[PDB]
Write an enzyme that holds these catalytic residues in place. Structure first.
Site, PDB file in Angstrom:
ATOM      1  N   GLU A   2     -93.665 -15.222 -25.859  1.00 52.58           N
ATOM      2  CA  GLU A   2     -94.197 -14.290 -25.221  1.00 52.58           C
ATOM      3  C   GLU A   2     -95.569 -14.617 -24.906  1.00 52.58           C
ATOM      4  OE1 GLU A   2     -94.011 -10.617 -27.432  1.00 52.58           O
ATOM      5  OE2 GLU A   2     -94.979  -9.272 -26.253  1.00 52.58           O
ATOM      6  N   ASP A  57    -101.873  -3.423 -24.316  1.00 53.50           N
ATOM      7  CA  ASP A  57    -101.761  -2.428 -24.991  1.00 53.50           C
ATOM      8  C   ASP A  57    -102.609  -2.803 -26.084  1.00 53.50           C
ATOM      9  OD1 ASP A  57     -99.170  -2.724 -23.940  1.00 53.50           O
ATOM     10  OD2 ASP A  57     -97.645  -2.938 -26.197  1.00 53.50           O
TER      11      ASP A  57
END
EC number: 3.2.1.208
Lengths: 445, 445, 445, 445
Positions: free
Chosen positions: D418, D181
Site C-alpha cells: 500500500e 484519511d
C-alpha cells in the site's frame, strides 16, 4: 532465417557500434561514404545519440560544430573533414575559405545553414548528465558556460538575418537549408531558378547511391549548384542575398523547429541562470515564430504552407512539413484536431498500404509521391524521432509512444537506413546513417 | 543519483561503444592504455563480443591473431601494435624478431603462449552467423576454409610440444602463459626462480595503475622478466626450454580449457566436413586432457591441482583454478557433487561477505587472499563468463543462468572493469577492459 | 493494427492472468471449457507456470494431483472437478468410483495414466524456491517431505507394472495415456481395435471445438470409448489388463520422459538427503529406460520407434516422437548426430513452408500429415517447451535458445492456443490453454 | 539471496496474478483482507491495471462501480461485497440502505464520495482498445454508449452540489472523501470536530494492520465515526449537509484531479461525438476548477492550500497536496517553476535520506512528518502513478519518466505494498494492494 530482426539489446549495441565507427576523432560523419563529413543538424542528432554513451563525447560533437560557426553567428550546414574527398560540392566548389569574410579561419565549411535542432540536443545532454552524477553534470554545465553565448548568436542570426521583416518565418536561400533537398515543397520555386554559365561538374552522390530512383535528378543538381554560384558572386554577404538569389522561400517547418528550439533554450537558460535578457529574447522569438507558423495554416485542416518570397505565393504541397504547427503549438483547438486527423488518416500515417504506422515524407496519395525518391515519399527515421519527441513535449504521450514503437519496429532490421520505402519497408539511401542510429539509441538509451 | 546502474539496452550500447573504441583497425586492444596491444585470449573474447555486432569484424580479429601464429603453430600471447609504446615488456625486450626462428616475419609478437579459448570464439561466431542469413554464413564458412588448418596446428603444437610425455596436461614455462600472472598457484614455483644478471628495466603497468595494491610487486616482475632472459638465451627454441627454464609447471586450468576447446573444434570439424583425421585427433586430445585434469584431483573435494615439474610436487592452493574439472567434465559423479559443493559453499561463491554470488579468483578464507591484488582475490568478469558458458555446455542451465545474472548485476555500473573487489564491488585494474565488455555483449547479444 | 503482438511484459502479464483465471481454488483447469478439469501432465506444466508467481500455489497444484493418486501408485490422467460437466468421457462413463478398487475415495478420477513429467515440475519449483529465500525454501522442502514417498510410488508403479518384462519401455493400454491422442503413431494398433457393443454416447469435445478438421473423428472416438469398456470389464485391475486389452503399445516418448524424470528425481533426492535406496532405484530406472529407448532406434538415423506388443511389430511413423532419444540421452555419437540432422532438416524444423523454426507434431512430408488435425501435424507449445528444456539439460544451449525464441515469437499473439497451424501460424484447438501460458511464464519467469 | 528483486517480466506477471486473485467476479477488492470490497478510486486504478490484460474485464470493473451510482449522481467511495465482513465501518454502520433515499437499491454502498479519477481510467481503456483492433474497440465504444450519461451525471453532481458557490473547488464533508484519511491537511479542521454520544464500535483495520505506527489512532477514528452520525441524522441529504456537518473543507488536490478529469472526458467526448452541450459543460468545469486550484496558491512558491470552510481559513500544511496545480495546469510561469523547485528540492523528492527519488505524502522536514503513519509521511505508489501520468500529460516527459523508473525500482520487491517507508523502503500497510499492482501493470503494460 525465419525472422531477420534484432532484439532491443542487440539493436542498441549495433547502433552504438555504428556511431563510434563513424567517429573521425572529434566529429562524426553523417554516413560512412555518402556523407563523409559533419552535417549541422545530423550533428545535433549524433550528439543526442551519444549522450547515453558518453556525455563528454556528445559535448565534443557540439563543440566541434560550434567551432565552425561563422563570425555573424551562422552555423554552416557542412563542416568538412580535412583531407576527405568523395562528397560534391566539396570545399573547393563552395570556396567560402577564400570568398566568405565571415567563415571561420580554422575550419572548412559550406556557405549555407540548416535547421536549429541544436538546443534539443543540448536538452538531452543535460537530462542524461543529471542522471549520471556530479562529475558528469560538471561536464555538461561547463559546456553551457563555454557555448551559451555561441548558441545565442546562432539563434540571434536566424531571428535577425533570416527574418529581416520580423514575419516569424525563416527565409531560405537554398533548398539544402531545409534539410529536405528535393521536397515537392520547393518545386515551383526551383522552376524559377534559371542557371547561367554553370561551371562543369561531376556528381559524387550517385556514384555511391547508384539507383537513380533514390536520389535527385541531374536537372535538380544543376539548380542546386547554380544557387552556389549566385552566393559566391556576392561573397556570401548576408546583406546582398535578397537582391541576387533566384531562390527565396520561407520554410514553415524550419520555422516551427526554431520556435521549439528557442523555448527549449530559454528553459535551459532559466534552469542554469543564464542572462535574463537572453532568456527574454528567446521567449520572444519562440512566440514570434509560433505565430508566424500559425499564420500560414489552412483554415480547414490546419496544414502549414511554405511561402515563396519571390513569387509572393503560398506553396501548397502534401508533405510532412504541413504538420509544422503540431511541433510548436499555437493552432486553435478545433484546427489542431483537424490537423491531427489529417496526420493520422489515410493520406499519411493511416494510409492502408503502409508497412508501418509512420509519417511518409510526401503523402502517398499526392501526385508528387515517389516511393523511393529521397524526400518525395520515403519514411525518414529522423522525422519519426523529431515528431515523437515534439509530440511528447506537447503532452501527447500515447501518440509519441506509438510513433516510437513503429520506428523501433522499422529499425529492427539493423540496417540503420537513411530512409525506408513506405510500402515494402526496403532500406533506401545510405546504410549506416548516423542520425538513424541516434534515433534508435535515444529511444532505447 | 539514487541508483547508478544502467539498463540492459544502455549497458549493451556502452559495451559495444567501448569495443569499437579499442579497435585500432584490424586488432582490438585489450584495454585503452594498460594493454595497448592484442593479447591472445583477450582477442578470442573480443571476437566473441564482436560476433553480435559484426560477424565480418569478429572474423577479422581472429584472422589478425592467426596471422601472427609462429611457424611451429604457437599463438604468441601478445601481437604488438606497430609504433605503440607504453607496455613493458615490449617488442625490444622480447627480441623475438631477431632471436626466434619461428616468429612471424610480418608481425611483432611476444615469445610465450596463452590458453586456447579460440575454438570457443569460433563456435560463437558460427552460431551468430547461422542466425544472420546466407551471406553471413558464407563469411563464417570462408574463415573456416582459410583457418581450419591453422587452428589444427595451434592445437597440435600444444598437444605435441607442451605435452611431450603425453600426460594430458599443458606445461607452462611462464606464469604469464596461465593468464593468471600472480596467482597463488605459482608462488612456490616462482620461489625457485633465481635471477642472474637481470638487465635494468622500468615497469610501465604501475605508471598506469598507480595503486600498488592492485598489481604484482617489483620482486614478482624481477622473476617474470628473468624468465624472458632464460628463453632469449636459447632463442625461444622449443627443444631447449626443458633444459634451461627455471619455471616449469603443468597448468590444470589451461589443460581443462584445452580439453573443452578440442571437443568444441572437433564438433565444428564434423559440422563443416573438415578432414576426418583432424576430427579424430581433436577427440583424442579432448579425452587425453580431460583424463589428465581428473588425475590431478583431490580425492575428497574433486579440486584440481597444478603440478610443479621441476620440484615434482602437486601445487595445492585455493584459487578458482581448482574448479578446472567442472569445465571439461570427467570426475566420478560423487566427486563432482563435492566439487560443486566447494564452489557454491562459504569458501567461494557462498562466502557471506561477497557483494555478488560470483567466483573470487582466490578463496576469501585462504591465507593467500588479497581483496585488491589482481589474481590473488578479486572477482574477474572474464572468469564469470567462461564458467557460465562451460556450465551451460555441461547442461547446468540454472547454474549458468545464476552466474550470468550476478555478472550482469556487477557489470551494470558500466565501468567494464578488469576485475572487482569481492566485498565492496569497487572496480579495479583497468577500466574499459575489452573482454569484460565482450562478456556483457555475449550475455545480452 | 500494424503489429498485433504483445511485448514480453504484456505477454507475461496476460499469461499469469490466464493461469489465475483457470484456477478453481486448489486445481487449475487445462482449458476454460474444452478441458474443465485437472489433467495430469497439464498439472505438471501448470505447476511450472506457477513457480515464478507463487511457490506455495505451485506446490498446492501438485498436492492436489497426488491426493488423487491410486493406492497402487498410478497417477490417473484426469482428476475431475466436483460438479463440473462438459467433458466426455466424464466420471459416470469411467465408473472408477465404483469399479476401481485402487481409485481414491476422495477424488473422482479417470482410470488410465499419463506421462511422468512431474519430477521436472518439482525441479523448477525448487530452483525458483532457492532464489526466493528461507521462508519459500521451507515451503518447497516441506512439500518434498510430504510427497517424496508418493513420487517414488508413482515412478515405481510405472517401472514395475507398465514394464512387467523389464524391457525399459512403458506399456500403454490407451492412446490417451501418451498425451498424443490421435498421433499417427497409434493408427495401425487402433486399426486392430474392433469395438463390439459400445454403449451410446455423445461427444462434447466437438461441441466446443466445432471445426471438424481440428479434432479426432467419430470413428476414432468409437475406438477410444471401446478400450474404456475393456478396462471397466476387469475393474481396472493391473493384473488383468494384458489379457483383455485390444490396445497394447510400448511408448518410446513416454519412456524417454520417464528416464529423464527418474534422473531428475534422483538428483533431487541426493540434494535433499532422501533414502539412499530410493536414489539408487531412481538411477537404476533412469538407465534402464534410457537403454530401452535406445534399443528402439534406427541404427542409421537414430529415430525412435514405438512397439505394438500385440502385433509384435515396430511402429515406424514420422512424428515428433522419433526424437525421444534426444531427451534422455544414450545414443552413440554418430547416431545422435544423424537424429539431430533429421530434426533440423527439411522433414521437420527445416521444412521451407513452416512459419516458425519449431517441431511439428507430424512431419509435413509424411503421408499422414494433416496441418490442423490435433497431433497429426500442428505445432504444440507444450512440446516446444519440453524439447527446449531437455535440450538445455543436454548442454545444447543454442539449440534450446532457438526453440525458446521461436516459441515466444509464436506465442506473442497472446492467444495461448493449444496448438498452431504449422504453415500459417493460425491458433488452433482451445484458446487459453493452461500449459501454453505456463511455457511462456517459464521462458520469461 | 544477493538480489531479491524481480525482473520486469516477473514483476508484470506477479502484478497480473495479484489483480486476478483479488477479483470476486465483477469487482476487485482493494486489498485481500484490509479492504475486502470495492473502493471508488481504487476501482478506477484497477480498471487501468486491467486494460492491458483484458479490455472487456476492465470495462466490467467500471460498470460495477457505476451500477452503484446514487440517483443524484454521486459515486460512493465504497461498494460493499455481498456477505463480506471484516471492514469497519461496514454497511450496518453506514445504514445508507435505509436512510439514504438516493442510494441504489441493488448495491450496499457508503454515504460519501471520493476523487473523480474515473475519466483517466476511461482514457487508458480507450488507448489500449485502439491498439487491439476492431472487436476490442467495439467493447470500449459500447461502454461509452452505456455509461457516458452516468459519467456526466457524476461530474455534474461534483460541480453542482460539492461546489455550490461556483468557487471552482470541491467541498468535502469527511476526510475519507480525500483519499488521504489522516493527512496533516485535515488536522486543524478535525480538532474542531467534537463527538457527542458516539455509539460503541470496534475497529477492524488495526486487527489486520496490527502495528499501531502504520494506522490512524483511536482518537482519530472517534472523529471519523462521529461525522458518520452527523450524516445519518439528516439521511445523507445533500441539501442538509452544509448546516450540520462539523467538517467542511475545500480539497485542492481533489479539485485538481477534477479539472484534469473534466478535460480528459471532454476530449473523449469530442473523439466519440458525444453531445456538444456535454463537451461544453466539461470544458467549462475543467477551466473553472483549474482556476479554483490556482486561486489557492502561494504567490511566491505556487503551493496549493486547502480551505476550511467553517473556520474560513486557508489550511497551510506541507504535504504532497501542495503540488495539485502541477496536475491541472494554470499557474503563471514563474510560480510553476517555483513549485517544481519545491517538489524536486530537499523538502520532498530531493530529501537526502530518501531511498528513492519519489514524493513522500508529507514533507520529511515537516513537524507533522511520521515515516510510517499512513498519509503522514510514507511514499504511496498510487500517487507516484498519478503524478507521473499527469506530468507526462503536461509534456514533462523526463520528469514523468524519472518518477516511473523510481516507482518501478521501489515496486521491484514484488510486495505490492500500500505504501513504503520513505527512508528504508520497508513495505507498509497492506501487502497485495490492488492499485499498487495496477500502477506497475500500467508502467509496463
Amino acid at each position: 532465417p525465419h525472422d531477420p530482426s534484432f532484439t532491443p539489446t542487440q539493436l542498441a549495441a549495433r547502433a552504438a557500434y555504428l556511431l563510434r565507427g563513424n567517429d573521425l576523432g572529434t566529429m562524426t560523419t553523417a554516413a560512412p561514404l555518402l556523407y563523409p563529413h559533419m552535417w549541422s543538424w545530423d550533428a545535433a542528432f549524433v550528439a543526442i545519440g551519444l549522450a547515453p554513451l558518453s556525455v563528454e563525447r556528445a559535448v565534443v560533437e557540439l563543440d566541434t560544430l560550434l567551432s565552425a560557426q561563422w563570425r555573424n553567428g551562422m552555423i554552416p550546414h557542412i563542416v568538412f573533414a580535412n583531407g576527405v574527398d568523395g562528397y560534391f560540392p566539396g570545399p573547393a566548389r563552395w570556396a567560402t575559405a577564400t570568398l566568405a569574410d565571415n567563415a571561420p579561419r580554422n575550419r572548412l565549411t559550406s556557405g549555407i545553414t540548416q535547421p536549429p535542432v541544436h538546443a534539443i540536443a543540448v536538452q538531452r545532454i543535460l537530462e542524461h548528465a543529471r542522471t549520471r552524477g556530479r562529475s558528469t553534470r560538471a561536464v555538461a554545465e561547463a559546456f553551457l558556460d563555454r557555448r551559451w553565448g555561441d548558441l545565442m548568436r546562432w539563434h540571434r542570426w536566424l531571428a535577425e538575418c533570416r527574418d529581416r521583416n520580423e514575419r516569424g518565418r525563416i527565409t531560405l536561400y537554398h533548398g539544402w537549408e531545409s534539410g529536405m533537398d528535393n521536397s515537392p515543397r520547393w518545386d515551383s520555386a526551383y522552376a524559377n531558378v534559371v542557371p547561367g554559365k554553370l561551371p562543369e561538374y561531376q556528381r559524387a552522390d550517385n556514384v555511391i547511391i547508384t539507383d537513380p530512383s533514390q536520389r535527385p535528378s541531374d536537372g535538380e543538381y544543376d539548380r542546386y549548384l547554380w544557387l552556389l554560384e549566385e552566393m559566391k558572386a556576392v561573397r556570401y554577404d548576408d546583406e546582398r542575398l535578397p537582391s541576387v538569389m533566384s531562390f527565396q522561400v520561407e520554410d514553415v517547418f524550419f520555422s516551427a523547429i526554431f520556435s521549439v528550439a528557442c523555448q527549449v533554450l530559454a528553459e535551459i537558460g532559466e534552469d542554469y541562470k543564464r542572462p535574463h535578457a537572453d532568456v527574454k529574447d528567446l521567449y520572444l522569438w519562440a512566440e514570434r515564430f509560433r505565430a508566424g507558423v500559425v499564420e500560414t495554416t489552412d483554415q480547414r485542416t490546419g496544414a502549414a504552407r511554405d511561402f515563396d518570397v519571390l513569387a509572393e505565393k503560398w506553396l501548397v504541397t502534401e508533405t510532412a512539413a504541413q504538420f509544422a504547427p503540431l511541433l510548436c503549438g499555437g493552432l486553435p483547438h478545433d484546427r489542431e484536431r483537424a490537423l491531427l486527423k489529417l496526420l493520422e488518416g489515410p493520406r499519411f500515417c493511416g494510409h492502408p498500404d503502409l508497412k508501418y504506422g509512420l509519417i511518409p515524407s510526401t503523402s502517398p496519395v499526392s501526385r508528387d509521391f515517389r516511393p523511393r525518391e529521397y524526400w518525395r515519399g520515403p519514411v525518414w527515421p529522423v522525422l519519426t524521432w523529431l515528431f515523437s519527441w515534439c509530440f511528447a513535449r506537447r503532452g501527447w504521450a500515447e501518440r509519441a509512444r506509438l510513433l516510437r514503437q513503429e520506428g523501433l519496429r522499422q529499425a529492427s532490421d539493423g540496417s540503420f537506413a537513411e530512409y525506408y520505402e513506405p510500402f515494402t519497408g526496403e532500406p533506401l539511401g545510405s546504410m549506416q546513417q548516423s542520425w538513424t542510429a541516434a534515433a534508435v539509441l535515444d529511444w532505447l538509451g
